[PDB]
Amino acid sequence: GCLGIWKACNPSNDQCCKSSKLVCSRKTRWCKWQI
């Protein structure tokens, strides 16, 4: 499943929403797409 944009992802386990192309930010723990 996905994770929302401002949601807490895993810095050392990038997953997030691969479907919507959001990648986890490591230093910031949120998901980011274009930002």
CB burial of residue 22 (10 Å; 0-12, 13-18, 19+): buried
In angstroms, what CA-CA distances link 18 with 24, 25, 26, 33? 10, 13, 16, 10
- Tokens 């230093």 -> residue: 27
Give me the half-sphere count of Cα atoms (radius 13 Å) on the Cβ side of residue 5. 6
Q: How many residues does the structure list for the chain? A: 35
Please give the Cα distance from 35 to 33 (Å, whole number). Answer: 6
Domain range for 27 is 1-35
| Total domains, the chain | 1
Residue 7 · residue 32 · CB < 8 Å: no
Question: Kindly report the CA angle at 20 between 16 and 22, in degrees rounded to 5?
Answer: 40
